[PDB]
Scaffold this active site. Sequence first.
Site: not given
Lengths: 184, 288, 164
Positions: A69-71
């Site tokens: 769920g990281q950028k």
Amino acid sequence: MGLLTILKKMKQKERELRLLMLGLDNAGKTTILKKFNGEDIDTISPTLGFNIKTLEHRGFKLNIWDVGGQKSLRSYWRNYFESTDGLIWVVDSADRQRMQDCQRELQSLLVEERLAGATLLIFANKQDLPGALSSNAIREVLELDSIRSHHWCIQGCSAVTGENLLPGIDWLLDDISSRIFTAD
Amino acid sequence: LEAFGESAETRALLGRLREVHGGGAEREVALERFRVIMDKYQEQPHLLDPHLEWMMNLLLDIVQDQTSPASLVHLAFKFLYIITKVRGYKTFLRLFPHEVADVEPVLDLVTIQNPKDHEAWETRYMLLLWLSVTCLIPFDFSRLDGNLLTQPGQARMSIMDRILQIAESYLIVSDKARDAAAVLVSRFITRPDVKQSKMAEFLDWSLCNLARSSFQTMQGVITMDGTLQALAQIFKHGKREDCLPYAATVLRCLDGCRLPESNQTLLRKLGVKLVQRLGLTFLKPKVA
Amino acid sequence: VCGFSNLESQVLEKRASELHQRDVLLTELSNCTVRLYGNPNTLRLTKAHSCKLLCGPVSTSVFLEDCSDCVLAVACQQLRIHSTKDTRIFLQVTSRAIVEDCSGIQFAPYTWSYPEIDKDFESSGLDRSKNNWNDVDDFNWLARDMASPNWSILPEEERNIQWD
Ligand SMILES: Nc1nc2c(ncn2[C@@H]2O[C@H](COP(=O)(O)OP(=O)(O)O)[C@@H](O)[C@H]2O)c(=O)[nH]1
Ligand SMILES: [Mg+2]
């Protein structure tokens, strides 16, 4: 290829469904997966890539994926939008500051040409948290009511306690089986 | 057949690899024994789904060890390939490792392969598919290299650069490794960074291959089939807004290649395939 | 909901009655020192500059975001960092920790303790025998040989930080 062989192939494909799990970081995307199989969640580490799990449920072979769920891991979600029979977006209920990031992520995912043919499952995780937003509140901040070209649904759950996850998965599987075949 | 009732035999055969890799008669006997045991489920290999992982990990702890000789590693990869023909690769590769610590160990193994070694073609086949299951990593190939200016006098070549030089070389071979090269590019050019870096180079290489190759010279036909398969896979598993810009030049070249009149059934099939892959890039996907 | 928002040069403190399974969020803090005495459910720090946060065991992960010149000391199961600079954390992690868009980061083994602490560790359910404060992963640095130029282990000389 004969009609009989063509039918033998259609059955094997329908017997195997695909569910892509996405959502903001630290939303419990791995805890739900580990609880749905009966594994341990206390020894979970923050995923630094992606995971896949092939399980069986209600006669269906579910190959559940779970991407970070990281950028820097959000610019690669397009690499898993193929042959996706269903999508599961996880949202942190206790998270009230980043409520627009998820609403912006889901909107960009809804306008995807490859994800048009799938069933949306909104898992409002972390419900036991004292400062957790109810299902009605989350159904108003993520702009879920506006959706019309997707069979969406929103149910509150708690991965630590394994509550309300089985009903949601059952509803998703039923809505996926209601259809016949998918597009290429 | 309800379940796999030959687990102990297969386990013993797999364990005997570490003490049968120096034999020529026993090696073939074990291979023929592993083949006849796995062929029983060729009509319904799904029954072997629950076992896949353990056998795969067994064959992996023999090819993933540093004290493993080339000969012992080659038998493990032959077994691995035997399990990928019966279950198939599309379903058996989903269980392979995909951690960021498996990007350089797999590319370095791909860089010690003998292309002229026809006896070890299963090794090269299993290498390319593994390298392709490792291009799903949700990170840029740049973050992995770190610093390229660390070796004075001769700078190290980037991971993405090495993969582009591995795919172009394996896409013109005459063994089964070319098919493994078609599955690699499909998961190499269809990512963000590679798309912005080497897409134009790969397209120029393909357009040059289909601008110089023929359906008469043997190696020319080998160059034609691989290029068409790669283009078809890219247009199938590729984004429609990154591809539509190149759909006009690809069809213009395929038209000049003259495939319908050529005397090859595979080339014409791939050509029709590439033509239908370009055809959907112009229209918008509908949902009836 | 619990925590602090918009502070400036102020000493604070909380007990276990106000941190017994609750979300603690510290937003917009500068030159303020917090001393928590309990077992919060979740711990988050955002937009902290020259701060000094302290806390006991934690039931879930921790989340720092847009902080600098801060000094943390916690004992959680997970710790995520995003956009952090010149920060000294004495964290005790049972699983793994991550550092994103970070730089000039420094680590040390969690050593903070106060009266009635073993009790706080019993309600959280953390395994005290697991401590991986020297095995942090970096999203920006994914090399196999070289060490990331964005985090460093902290020397024993700097580990002696006068808390009181
Ligand atoms: N209180 C509470 N905490 C949870 C729940 N689900 C997960 N957590 C914690 O939230 C943290 C984030 O979990 P993780 O699965 O690593 O997030 P992800 O990596 O995005 O999937 C972990 O420390 C979990 O134990 C829940 O339902 N309730
Ligand atoms: Mg995770």
